[PDB]
């Protein structure tokens, strides 16, 4: 039986003095039990967030690189991470994707070498517009998927996240039956291409976007086993998407 | 100009090493002289300042070019100074050579760390090729050009000659190498800004620094201190921060 899983992705936003006032807010919050909630602040606030957050909540780092310690000037490892208190890190987000230019290849490595530090990964995977309107959705997160697979020796430790690109800024938004195709496919992929156990027991989250108002018909789906959600994170919204199965 | 001297830790250590280091340089007398800054990882921004004495300045290892964003695993110059770091690296070889960050997102980094009221160490250099095609004064002049066109107040940044070249390559720089390339450079300055920018400006060297080499470096005439890797992680920093001593 799966548990339903919620994120917060910060990305870029915040300071000490308004992330603690989003924080208190969270900490008053009354969590279910049945929910597992994560919080990933910037990358100078893991620390911070970590020493104010209720322990009910965890923190992820929003990035990592793919060794313990070295010549890497403003990068950080899961050794460290995991020294400030946290316990996941997101990987393969679209950001880091198309903005910072990382590859399958670096992603994978970076997984392997966070899932052998002791870390979580919420790993991210989706395809932009012009590779869905063009008919190859399944060929690019099959492929995003399978080097993660690849880097993976204990997916009790993984969470996968399906963003859909293609449907971010660009004028498009996506349905609830579209989110709920895609997580079906992977599962199946998780299937055939790892095992079945693997399949019924990993949590794939959706990180499109998610409101108050969209969440519960996106969490009724029944391959959509909760959300990595963006700019309602930083919103009490947030309290909402977490009880989308209440 | 007063001696400068920058610790980059890189991505090495955690809280309990590094706390001993901070408490090895908390210890330490700095001299009058000399202004000392540490770079710690990311994550140990906020711990590292914290610990630090006051009389050592914090500096971040990078930072993107807007105050808040939808930038995954990003931080902006105001989430630095938010955490009471004074500084920011910014065109490290290993950000330029490994992360693939352009002069053009370097420049406007810059621009955006500087407007923000943080402080720049702004760092340039040529690979072994540029340099064995005789092409050293063309890239690093063409480096600085673009730090320049996004500073407007030179009193906020120093600026760091990196030899990539003499990096893992099999050859080294010399200190009369060094000493060349930062006197091009405090020339350029006079040239292309002003002679009180070319004097008042800080030129520090940003290949290998030892104890055992320090003085020799720290004694030519058109270095002003060191962006140091390695040794920065161990109580052989005091000893290159008493450089001139």
Same mark, same amino acid.
């Given at each position: 039986?799966?548990?339903?899983? =919620?994120? $917060?992705?910060?990305?870029?936003?915040?300071?000490?003095?308004?992330?603690? #006032? %989003? !924080? *208190?807010?969270?900490? +008053?919050?009354?969590?279910?039990?049945?929910?597992?909630?994560?919080?990933?602040?910037?990358?100078?606030?893991?620390?911070?967030?970590?020493?104010?957050?209720?322990?009910?909540?965890?923190?992820?780092?929003?990035?990592?690189?793919?060794?313990?310690?070295?010549?890497?000037?403003?990068?950080?490892?899961?050794?460290?991470?995991?020294?400030?208190?946290?316990?996941?890190? =997101?990987? $393969?987000?679209?950001?880091?994707?198309?903005?910072?230019?990382?590859?399958? #290849? %670096? !992603? *994978?490595?970076?997984? +392997?070498?966070?899932?052998?530090?002791?870390?979580?990964?919420?790993?991210?995977?989706?395809?932009?517009?012009?590779?869905?309107?063009?008919?190859?959705?399944?060929?690019?997160?099959?492929?995003?998927?399978?080097?993660?697979?690849?880097?993976?020796?204990?997916?009790?430790?993984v969470v996968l996240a399906y963003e859909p690109v293609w449907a971010i800024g660009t004028g498009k938004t996506a349905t609830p039956q579209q989110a709920q195709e895609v997580?079906?496919?992977?599962?199946?992929? %998780?299937?055939?291409?790892?095992?079945?156990?693997?399949?019924?027991?990993?949590?794939?989250?959706?990180?499109?976007?998610?409101?108050?108002?969209?969440?519960?018909?996106?969490?009724?789906?029944?391959?959509?086993?909760?959300?990595?959600?963006?700019?309602?994170?930083?919103?009490?919204?947030?309290?909402?998407?977490?009880?989308?199965?209440?």
């Amino acid at each position: 039986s799966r548990k339903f899983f =919620v994120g $917060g992705n910060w990305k870029m936003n915040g300071r000490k003095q308004s992330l603690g #006032e %989003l !924080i *208190g807010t969270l900490n +008053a919050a009354k969590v279910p039990a049945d929910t597992e909630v994560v919080c990933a602040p910037p990358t100078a606030y893991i620390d911070f967030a970590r020493q104010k957050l209720d322990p009910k909540i965890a923190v992820a780092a929003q990035n990592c690189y793919k060794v313990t310690n070295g010549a890497f000037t403003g990068e950080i490892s899961p050794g460290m991470i995991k020294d400030c208190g946290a316990t996941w890190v =997101v990987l $393969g987000h679209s950001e880091r994707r198309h903005v910072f230019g990382e590859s399958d #290849e %670096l !992603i *994978g490595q970076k997984v +392997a070498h966070a899932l052998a530090e002791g870390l979580g990964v919420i790993a991210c995977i989706g395809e932009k517009l012009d590779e869905r309107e063009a008919g190859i959705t399944e060929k690019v997160v099959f492929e995003q998927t399978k080097v993660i697979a690849d880097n993976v020796k204990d997916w009790s430790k993984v969470v996968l996240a399906y963003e859909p690109v293609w449907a971010i800024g660009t004028g498009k938004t996506a349905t609830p039956q579209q989110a709920q195709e895609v997580h079906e496919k992977l599962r199946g992929w %998780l299937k055939s291409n790892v095992s079945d156990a693997v399949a019924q027991s990993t949590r794939i989250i959706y990180g499109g976007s998610v409101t108050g108002a969209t969440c519960k018909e996106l969490a009724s789906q029944p391959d959509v086993d909760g959300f990595l959600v963006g700019g309602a994170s930083l919103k009490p919204e947030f309290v909402d998407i977490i009880n989308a199965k209440q």
